[PDB]
Amino acid sequence: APMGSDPATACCFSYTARKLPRNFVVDYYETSSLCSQPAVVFQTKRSKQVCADPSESWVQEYVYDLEL
Ligand SMILES: [Zn+2]
Ligand SMILES: [Zn+2]
Ligand SMILES: [Zn+2]
């Protein structure tokens, strides 16, 4: 899951290989450009924080859905 728990500095070294159901995703943040790779981290109803590849369409669609 990300290394660290502060959205300002936590980094992802892998991405989820499963699609998260929209009904279980409740929040997100973007990882810092200081991290080795870009990532969105989604928080879920099971209290997980899940790294995801921002180049995937569904990740972008969920981010807009949460933000706006
Ligand atoms: Zn939040
Ligand atoms: Zn779409
Ligand atoms: Zn904001």
Author numbering: 1 to 68
Authors' own words:
CC chemokine ligands (CCL) comprise 8-14 kDa chemotactic cytokines (chemokines) involved in diverse immune functions. Extensive structural analyses reveal that most chemokines share a common core structure: an N-terminal extension followed by a 310 helical turn, an anti-parallel three-stranded β-sheet, and an α-helix. CC chemokines also readily dimerize, primarily through the formation of an anti-parallel β-sheet at their N-termini. Certain chemokines, e.g. CCL3, CCL4, and CCL5 form polydisperse, high MW reversible polymers in excess of 600 kDa without the assistance of GAG.
The crystal of CCL4 P8A diffracted to 1.6 Å resolution is in space group C2. Unlike our previously reported crystal structure of the wild type CCL4 polymer, the structure of CCL4 P8A is monomeric. CCL4 P8A maintains the typical chemokine fold. However, CCL4 P8A has a distinct structure at the N-terminus. Instead of the extended loop found in wild type CCL4, the absence of proline at position 8 of CCL4 allows aa 6-9 to form a type 1 β-turn so that the N terminus turns back toward the three-stranded β-sheet of CCL4. This permits favorable hydrogen bonds to form between the main chains of residues at the N-terminal loop of CCL4 (Met3 with Cys11; Asp6 with Ala10). All prolines (Pro 7 and 8 in wild type and Pro 7 in P8A mutant) are in the trans configuration, thus the formation of type 1 β-turn is not due to the switch of cis-trans peptidyl bonds of proline. The N-terminal conformation of CCL4 P8A would lead to steric clashes between two monomers of CCL4 P8A, which prevents dimerization, explaining why CCL4 P8A is polymerization deficient. Furthermore, the structure of CCL4 P8A reveals that the P8A mutation promotes the formation of an N-terminal type I β-turn, which prevents the formation of anti-parallel β-sheet essential for CCL4 dimerization. A P8A mutation renders CCL4 predominantly monomeric without disturbing the integrity of its core structure (aa 10-69).
